Design a protein around this ligand. Structure first.
Ligand SMILES: [Zn+2]
Length: 296
């Protein structure tokens, strides 16, 4: 398969491709693994125990706490759990700032994220750069269709910590964080952007996602057949399930998929180093972290 775009199936090969004229547009697909080093737990991991200690709320079924209709009937369990799990700090990771550098260098077509933690926005990705496939806590909206007053995270955090159920100042309906609940569709933006972006992509950077939740995981099968796909993740992921266009890292037919196994921050640091960006990345992270630490 000598017509392949990567000269070798390694991080070095990906970096050479990125700095070549053939690689102009990068799509990042990111999940919980890019935020665990910021102290944000993987909410979909059973080890997080998201559905443990819910007996106190007397739910009809455990998932009711994340179901839109139940939430509109009984929002208190959700907000109590949100207080319990609310992060102590919102400091984006090296990986988030690596994506900001991609944006700065003119390479970022889009970041599709499964995360709700807002760290992409704090790191400087703008609305146009992002597809928050599972929604976000970055904004909240009044639930009444005729009103839809928007509230920022600071307002919602004050309500969560004072243990006052958030109500709209205009109409007194419940205000809900913009995360996708059970019984809700993924945002239209997810499908709209997918249909356009994957015609234009030169590289998929898949970071911190095990590609286990649909339809987000299917994004990898939307890339053109020639598009290299780099996985930076603690574990290999995205390969075909031996039971049930997956990643092929290791067969003799492999031609475009590369796995770098380790912490996402370390993989992004290694890639930045190959690209000559390590000092830029360090300076950016150190300045942004200093700024966050110095909020007065
Ligand atoms: Zn309202």
């Amino acid at each position: 398969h000598m017509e392949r775009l990567l000269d070798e199936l390694t991080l070095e090969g990906v970096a050479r491709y990125m700095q070549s004229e053939r690689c102009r547009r990068v799509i990042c697909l990111v999940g919980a693994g890019i935020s665990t080093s910021a102290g944000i737990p993987d909410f979909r991991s059973p080890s997080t125990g998201l559905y443990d200690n819910l007996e106190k709320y007397h739910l009809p079924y455990p998932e009711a706490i994340f179901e839109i209709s139940y939430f509109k009937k009984h929002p208190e369990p959700f907000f109590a759990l949100a207080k319990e799990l609310y992060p102590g700090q919102f400091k984006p990771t090296i990986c988030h700032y690596f994506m900001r550098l991609l944006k700065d260098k003119g390479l970022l077509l889009r970041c599709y994220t499964q995360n709700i933690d807002t760290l992409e926005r704090i790191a400087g990705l703008e609305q146009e750069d992002l597809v928050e496939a599972h929604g976000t806590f970055y904004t909240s909206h009044c639930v009444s269709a005729s009103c839809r007053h928007e509230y920022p995270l600071s307002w919602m955090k004050e309500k969560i910590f004072s243990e006052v159920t958030p109500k709209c100042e205009d109409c007194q309906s419940l205000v809900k964080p913009d995360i996708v609940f059970f019984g809700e569709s993924l945002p239209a933006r997810f499908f709209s952007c997918m249909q356009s972006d994957f015609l234009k992509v030169d590289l998929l950077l898949v970071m911190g996602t095990s590609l286990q939740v649909q339809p987000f995981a299917s994004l990898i099968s939307k890339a053109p057949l020639s598009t290299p796909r780099l996985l930076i993740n603690k574990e290999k992921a995205g390969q075909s399930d031996p039971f049930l266009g997956g990643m092929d890292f290791d067969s003799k037919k492999a031609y475009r998929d590369v796995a770098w196994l380790g912490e996402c921050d370390q993989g992004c640091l290694a890639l930045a180093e190959l690209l000559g960006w390590k000092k830029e990345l360090e300076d950016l992270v150190r300045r942004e972290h200093a700024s966050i630490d110095a909020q007065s």
